[PDB]
Write a protein that binds this ligand. Structure first.
Ligand SMILES: *C(O)(O)NCCCCN
Ligand SMILES: *C(O)(O)NCCCCN
Ligand SMILES: *C(O)(O)NCCCCN
Ligand SMILES: *C(O)(O)NCCCCN
Ligand SMILES: *C(O)(O)NCCCCN
Lengths: 295, 297, 301, 298, 298, 296
């Protein structure tokens, strides 16, 4: 059993219809190169608006139900027979989430995951927009594979990757929007970013796909212009954490890698780390401060 | 710029003759409509006297089924004629169950369904617990032609949980038909300021406007222990999304209160303030207890 | 002076002996229904499986084939004519065949002759003399109420009368009077068993707890059935009765006479009393999930 | 006649409005029961004072006390232990801002086995309990005592076949109901005593378990917010057997100590053979989780 | 060839009227099966005593015992753990006032994995089980053991294609049915043994899963409420492969230990290839939720 | 010996790839069954030609014909009326965009009582039938004939206990299964597996069961060249305990005959008690494919 996976990497305008056209073009290119599952970067419908903390930007969110972009990519998924996770800004009554809908290769909406770990600070004021997610970590049975899909900042947390692996994830996927930080040009996070994820692939023995944005974006914030340069470096890592495919920090790209899932599942079983785990000794992971279990 | 809705609170006196009272309600709904109202709110159990001063066998038989209710049917025609949303408070019989209920009539005349009062008051003057099963619909929101609304009934208005329950389900405006006044056993009790402050609190905590329609007049009821009298204190009002009173009636005048709200701007304001973003349902399990320790079954 | 307002309904319990010939027993039933109507009855209740002997003392292959379809049943059709002629409601107990299922059933015939539908016995008894579990699928209609020309009524069958759940289910759905056609007597394996006082008390409790009148019609006479292991005899103990909404017996027959019991109820006064007593206002269904278990712990599927 | 035997007792007495006097009365009659061989002794509802629920008064709510270190429960634990008798203790419970009509079950070694909180709360003239008590949130309970597994509910609960069935399904071998019922002050023509008995006899017969009801006697005048209100409590404390037969009964004015012995092994065998529990149809009982016969409650 | 192999066994013996004797007989035959390589061993229905259901007797109901701390289950857990063998244990369960014909599945490490309660209850002369057992309320279950996911149901359940299909759908790799079937005391012309085998062979073949049936032998006479009643149990315990072929079978009168090995990975692959499960039409099977071919049950 | 008696027959023959010839063969064998007293006679599946269904050829699709005015059905109606026999007629149905593997039930007076459309269609490696047939949408049916209430299902339907139970719950007194099964002239021989599953249905439902299978070798040229199947016959009739009462071999024409007392069998079915004892409250999992999620 072999599945072909793709990371896409492109620049966005602040127009939904242009960006969706761009995603469609790169999804067809992926499909043309053999892709069964194609990963589109985080909040690709527009500019990464979380540089600002603005009332009007919250109203960019849309219900999960009858979402125009999801609906449009469901047609594309269906035509091509590819699996397409769709990053979007969800409104759910008065709650708001950074969410992702998993469309199967028959175009079926398989359900959503809501971003669990919400980043904060200059350039990435996501805590202002999003309730911390309440779906918990999830795995989706698609026509090709059980996949673990989480979102951007979730990729820094070994807990997220481990939870998806424990629930049957054969591949992990992280749509991303990370770049420079507007308050401090000396912060270059790209190597650190890659290393943490490489760690998750190696610790769980599962391949991993990260799709990140490129281009410079200037946002009109409540305190004036703020600029981020997104550094791309979209990549696909194998089950021991080796980078098999990688983009640069400036050019549009379509990454492709094939994995033998039944072989990798045998290596995983045979390595035996899941049977060697000591959940009896991991209670402290349910604390924040190293002592008090959360309610 | 944005969806506007004009809401109205009515305030009037009742006899114990249904036809008279429905006629009074119609006159005032028409008057609200003439002043631009899209949703009009009539006070609790308006079809007669506030009979719950007594605990009487014969008064339980004032209840009628929800199905083919002559007062709901009559007000459905008016709703349709005028293009206004009309919540209709009534005493519901449902086989051997009885409830203090409200049917939400949409602006096309459609009966959108019912809510059954959840929190039932008790004590001299207000012996509701004798008459009504505690409601079993739970808190509801209704999609009307003009807005998603949350409607609850009188005593429900004291409970922050009801208001929050409706808001979490997308209610854009909260409505509470009311019957509250003096208390026949103790003339020193004057609850009007307390009553208003608690509702203002709900409007401000959920960032939604709130409408409260209360009775006026003195009513004398024969009870098992002789006459009992309540002076209903009016003070019907409409509050905006920070809990500010935008319109209020006094304690004796018949009144038609009118207010317009921009539901898109308020939505935007509600979200921006951030309370719904910041709620901690993981820490709210104690709210599912009565005694602060034991969760109910 | 005017008498007190409200819908009055006159109900009747019949009590008679059966042969094992269908034509004879239907003739007996018609005779007693007519006598009940002559005494003012609006609703008349015939005992369980009146078409024949209480054959359930045996577990026999050939007795299963006494069952007949509900559709075009000759006894139901005949009693429909009588109901229409007299203007009386008549529930008709019969052994139902429904493809390969079999039930102990009752068809409710309205005062205009209309077949309102059926109830299938839910609780099926077992044991020497009363081997009903061999014959009947447990019923699958659930507890029902029927709107007749005179009243909304709840009808269940024999062993159902021991279950408070059945009486409450019918009352919660607006039953104004409860009816139980019965066949109960001695038990052939042990002559010390005399259940008649126990039997009455349980049903009196239903009437009192739901504040609705209750009618029980039971068989009389001795019947001997040829069983797979020899002859078996039951003496049916009569004691048909009508109870009011506090569980008081307003009329009762003895253990051997043929009887036509008659009582009038003001259903509007009773409804008022039922509601004022307050039990239905005070019920706690949030605490009753355990009733959906058999063993006090595990909810059934 | 082999089998585990248990002797139960219903007590019936008049109350003053002084706790000390009523607790002394209860102790006297518990000792009289024990002298007659009783293993489990049932004291009537809210026996610490007058039946105060004729009134709806602010100050009466403050008669409530916490379950923890309750002076009357602690005193009766001493007696339970001294005599080797099981004693359910009815009390008015405060639990932060909630209030309940409650009963603590004291085992024959003095151990406090836990509480049941009254589920069905009556209302109306003379019996304004809904003003005082949150509807109970323990659900129906059974308690394993030294002598038997028992089901204890409280007064108005005794009208509900659901409560009796719920306790029996959980293995209750005997049902107990402390009571306060009498005349009704707004209508002198109401005499509920025969109705009250018939409904409980029904529960005993339907579940094939014995049942004990202890009820108050005497006239009580309460100063209500609208003037004097009077109830004459009608006694009629009784013990019913597993077919609903009254085996012992008190009249409507006498102080009484009723006594009956039950063979719990034989009764268990009878209950099972009669077959009602074998034949129940919980798949058809979902309408019991409605109030109106149609909508399941949340 | 390659893949997870499992050795299963059907045991067949005659019962005495003494519980401990009968458990010792079971232990002896379990040990003999283990010696021949068995991983999962099936003991016949209600093996602790005579098949008492010929009678409808009050005292026989009290032969039931709770699942909790059941002395026969506890004893067989020790054997399971000692030998590393999976052992389903048939017993007569008391659960407050409910009673069931039940089976506890003991894993090869001695762990009590839970119980299944007999769903379909037979009736008629000689087999009056409806008098004793509530219809089961666990539903059909599959248990994950150290060696396989197994589906265990009980005697009469074996006539119902629905039970076997329910277990296969939930992952059962082997079906097991402890049995007590023989002659019928009211009609000596009834010989059901060929019919009995054919129906089970049909389940194995329709689901492509092996099937194990363990039945009693011996003549048993029971004192019924109407005199002596005799059943001659007919043995014919057997093991069927995934196309329904009988691979091992006992006769109608001797003790037997039957043994068969199955390659569960090859059978699984063969079942997936055959594709019947992906070809099923559940959208057309709603009539199966009726008894009468028309009205769905509640 | 009292009660309604019905004589049923299973026919078995080799198909040529010529329609007239095959219908002539069917008529000859129906007449022979009638001569031996048969009241209801079962002809094997798709008997008008070679079993084309696993060859995936677009030109074979035009063999389908509408249910309305079907020349083979209309001809067998005449035969049914002439002889006073019930004849289920297997045919390849064209229904607008859809195509089905279907069977029309002809009563003893020649009346067309209706159609059943094969429900279970094998898809995945080895079985490419979807190329020709849509999954049936009639659901499982019973038909009241002059002699009996009967249930009929087709070929692959044979493997599914649900179809047999569904028919019996609705009052079918006899089950009929026209089939076509064989193998590559391979090691696996499915004939015993097949019989055991069917004997299971008869025994579990306490109804007799009639199965008609073809014989002979058939060669079809396909996209992937010549495919050959040897059909293994073994048509049979089973009684209500699953006992085989007559059976054909794997190479000759056969006319199998058996008489059933439908009143006695009904009484036996009811007394055995399985239908009294069924637990539909516990069967919801059967409305899933994966053992957890109900289908729409
Ligand atoms: C996505 O937007 O969560 N990446 C967050 C990066 C935060 C860097 N300080
Ligand atoms: C409406 O009737 O619920 N108002 C109740 C007020 C109670 C005052 N103590
Ligand atoms: C009717 O037939 O159900 N009465 C059942 C009585 C059973 C007595 N043990
Ligand atoms: C106890 O106190 O609940 N008694 C209730 C009686 C109410 C009479 N209508
Ligand atoms: C086990 O006891 O279920 N076998 C029942 C057989 C009944 C025979 N008619």
């Amino acid at each position: 059993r072999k599945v072909v996976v793709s990371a896409l990497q492109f620049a966005c305008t602040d127009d939904v219809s242009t960006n969706v056209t761009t995603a469609e073009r790169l999804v067809r290119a992926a499909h043309k190169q053999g892709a069964n599952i194609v990963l589109i970067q985080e909040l690709f419908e527009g500019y990464y608006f979380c540089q600002a903390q603005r009332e009007d930007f919250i109203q960019r969110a849309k219900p999960y139900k009858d979402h125009p972009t999801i609906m449009r990519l469901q047609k594309l998924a269906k035509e091509l027979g590819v699996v397409i996770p769709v990053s979007f800004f969800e409104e759910a009554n008065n709650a708001h989430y950074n969410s992702i809908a998993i469309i199967d290769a028959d175009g079926t909406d398989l359900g959503i995951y809501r971003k669990s770990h919400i980043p904060d600070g200059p350039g990435y004021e996501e805590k202002f927009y999003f309730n911390p997610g309440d779906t918990g970590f999830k795995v989706f049975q698609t026509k090709y594979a059980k996949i673990g899909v989480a979102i951007c900042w979730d990729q820094w947390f070994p807990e997220a990757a481990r939870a998806m692996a424990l629930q049957g994830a054969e591949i992990l996927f992280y749509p991303t929007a990370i770049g420079s930080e507007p308050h401090d040009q000396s912060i270059d996070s790209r190597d650190h970013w890659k290393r943490v994820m490489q760690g998750h692939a190696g610790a769980n023995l599962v391949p991993l796909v990260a799709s990140n944005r490129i281009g410079n974006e200037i946002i009109e914030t409540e305190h004036g212009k703020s600029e981020i340069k997104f550094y791309g470096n979209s990549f696909i890592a194998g089950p021991t954490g080796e980078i098999v495919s990688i983009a640069d920090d400036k050019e549009e790209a379509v990454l492709i890698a094939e994995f033998n899932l039944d072989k990798i599942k045998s290596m995983r079983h045979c390595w035996g780390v899941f049977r060697d785990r000591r959940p009896d000794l991991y209670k402290v992971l349910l604390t924040l401060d190293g002592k008090n279990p959360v309610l």
